[model samples]
Target chain A: GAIKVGAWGGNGGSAFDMGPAYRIISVKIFSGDVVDGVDVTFTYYGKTETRHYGGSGGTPHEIVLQEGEYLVGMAGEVANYHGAVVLGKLGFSTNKKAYGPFGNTGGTPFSLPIAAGKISGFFGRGGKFLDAIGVYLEP
Target chain B: MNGAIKVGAWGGNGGSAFDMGPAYRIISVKIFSGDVVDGVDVTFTYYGKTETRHYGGSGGTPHEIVLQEGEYLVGMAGEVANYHGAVVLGKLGFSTNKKAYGPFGNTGGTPFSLPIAAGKISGFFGRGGKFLDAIGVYLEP
Candidate 1:
């Protein structure tokens, strides 16, 4: 059986969910034509850590994870750009979405039957908030 | 008490193992492709029935293998030129090397360490007539 993860992007903010009971094989970020300095923060087992990377491209980041859920949030210097991120695993897939605050706004969490080893999705502007739009999985 | 299966490429010939018992469940297969251009062929047998599958060659390919109640053996049929093959058992690492035997030739047999899960039985082969230059295994969940 596979596991599930979630992702969100909006106004200078991005959030991802690394599901519980699985290890983090790798993380990939795909962004549109926007150059903003991005910072990534990961929360696991009540402890949080952060890393930084240049915004507006695809990048693969490697990190080790335990048997718990994790939150990965990205903050950019600028807003109003489109991007997607992926959390990859060897045998597991994700079918859920993360619901939380997008920058300065908040939304209710919902469940969806998405599936993929490396889960990816679309995020863009929704008026004044960075909408955590569509979700997808990789083969 | 889960069963174990091991398969690999050695000396242009392939090796495979099938467990026959109640406490065995095959979950996945990890393969190492030698220099075989085409994909590797895997034959599975259960209760006097057989099924075959082809996997990619030239690199490591990990795929799922699910099985019901029966014994099983997976055999490979391909020519590996100048590389070794490995089979990972139940995500536990177990590897073996097969010497390079040409298309139709025989290299002297060599000793190797092939590991399996507890309470599992296995059968091995050495360099012989045909070339089976790949490695694969059935994992237990």
Candidate 2:
């Protein structure tokens, strides 16, 4: 069965590891209103890389990963200059737990187990799972 | 007060410290590059955050410090002369301790530390000086 591996909320950023050495194939974002972009950062082998995704409406973004340990982080917006206005982070644990700003129902976290693989989901307004953050894995 | 930290045999990439707490002060690091003109970049975990420092060229002269608290140290040397790759001779010394820890392989592991002392760590770099293979750190209290 798939499990809850990571999550984040609030305006600040957080980091988490992709548990169990799964090759991350893609990502999906759930939102309340049409937003601009979401920034994601990946760190592995002592190298750090960042990618930006279109946040307008809920959509799936394509990404590639190998079967190795990785440090992942997310932000709400990208700064005009260098850094980002980090909002929320990824969470990982053996037991399924939630971390980040609670209440208000902008991005409620959820997880879905599929025959193919596992994916994390989030709710938009009023505690509704609006988007499925799919993470494609390989055999 | 000042102490001595030196590098050891060349293996793969570089090395670092594991959770040495806040009592340790990292003054400088000794770097060896094939190309004295190319620069080297040093990164470490301080207090729970990652910090980066840069050193110019290569030499035995210890790079001076701005007095930073270091829990771990990781490094990568730049390209050598005539486009040859570079390697890090391992050595990280503290102002207080003088014991030695290791001469481990590159890309060893994380959160590894020694009892406060001087020791040999490993360092590695690619031909283009872009990839960092690993880092081994040793300490003494």
Candidate 3:
């Protein structure tokens, strides 16, 4: 079963949930001066699905997990920007290694305390600018 | 899966595959354990309610875990090892919203654990046999 965990960034944009996922295929990051947005692709029961969150205005980077590798947790920055709070830096940790601290560096830092097994999907609020982030997890 | 996902079986492929599917509420777990964890039975509320299903083989010290009203399981940790060329569960423990339960059976082998504080452990799935050859979890929000 998947569990919802963390909501980094402020409550501003509309809500988004990437539904059920069996294996994460790739994670695409859109970032520059600040954390701009994210895109993810995964599979479930033999079907493949993809989802996009926030705006597509920043530089892009894509990371793909090798067979048998998966994400364990995520980390990064969230802070007040342009009068409204928003998500800034972003990063991911997998069973194999850690990736990024992407986006701008200055902000309040956060991460989950436990490995909590694996992350099946993602959720939270986002819009023109990435406002918040969260994940659906399982162990 | 956003709503649920299966975690691990942590052992060998020596038994039949079984899944209790997703659950509404799990009320209790009846475990039979000794040198190796033998069998398990869980009582839960489902479509018809108070459903109890059995897994694994019989014969070991009996133990029961009765959950409090409004309480739910979040995560579990245990051990898995080789027994005469077959992999079996060696120890088992549970964590709930309110408390912790036993690490029943022999506490030796490769250890594994999973935690889901943001959601609940809805049910169980595994490869079953005279002993629980492998076990996994079903998680949900």
Candidate 4:
């Protein structure tokens, strides 16, 4: 089953939904002190797709998954900037391994983990920066 | 090792029970309350998933508890008493590695507090209705 996990970070910006993906293939993270953007490549019941989210640019790091390995979790930090809270860091985990502590660790940290599931997709709020992020999980 | 466990939900036994399963770590809690501790909604995560669930009826001003990085609930103390002729959670408060949260609601009931040797509170289980009927905890190592 596919489930919507959360919308962690702030409560503003335009909502973005990257619904129902299977077998995440690659991930590109744009970050620094905070999350700048994200680019992901994955599949939808055998169909391949790619998407980019958030601000135009920052620092970029990428992850390419091996066969049989799928994303299991998303982790990072979030801070209240002025008055609007925004995502401040980004990291990920899979069935077989873990990846990047992309953004700097500055604000309150948050993570989404599951004992027996894979990350299916992502959804949240974004603009010049990623205000929030959430995931879709396959259980 | 990524180990964890639970303690007591010291309250009563009027409503049905709730369990947030295994392999999940609590990240935040939303309390709905005014007079008596009305309901609780917890957000959780583990190896590869995240979720939020709750018990109790509709009613109360919303209050949220967002745990910071490296902060986890370690202990809890609360009061359990009769409210409107039914047993309910009168007050509630939590202790974390970093600080303490609350004693939200009325403090005129039988007070109960659980002593912990080691571990953090990761998951929760309990009962409720218009107000929380009982409470429990999951401690993690």
Number of the top-ranking candidate, with TM-score as the measure: 3
lDDT of 1 by residue, A15-89 (tens): 432232122333333333332222334444666545343344332333333353232322222223334222111
Clashing pairs in 1: A2-A92, A4-A94, A10-A130, B10-B98, B11-B98, B11-B99, B12-B131, B12-B132, B13-B132
Between prediction 1 and prediction 2, which has the larger lDDT? 1
> What's every prediction's RMSD, in angstroms?
17.6, 16.8, 10.1, 14.7
lDDT of 2: 0.27
Cα lDDT computed for each candidate against the true fold: 0.28, 0.27, 0.76, 0.72
Q: Indicate the docking level reached by candidate 3.
A: incorrect
RMSD of 2: 16.8
Give the TM-scores of the predictions, in the order they appear. 0.20, 0.24, 0.57, 0.52
Stretches off by above 4 angstroms in model 3 are: A1-135, B1-3
Q: What is the lDDT of residue A8 in candidate 4?
A: 71
Query: Which parts of model 4 are misplaced by more than 4 Å?
Result: B1-141
Taking all chains together, the TM-score of candidate 4 against the true structure is: 0.52
Candidate 2 chain B minimal-lDDT segment of 10 residues = B108-117
DockQ of 4: 0.01
Q: Which residue runs of candidate 2 sit more than 4 Å off their true CA positions?
A: A1-25, A28-59, A64-139, B1-71, B74-122, B127-141
Q: Cα miss at B125, model 3 (Å)?
A: 0.6
- For each candidate in turn, the interface RMSD (Å) is 18.3, 21.5, 8.6, 13.7
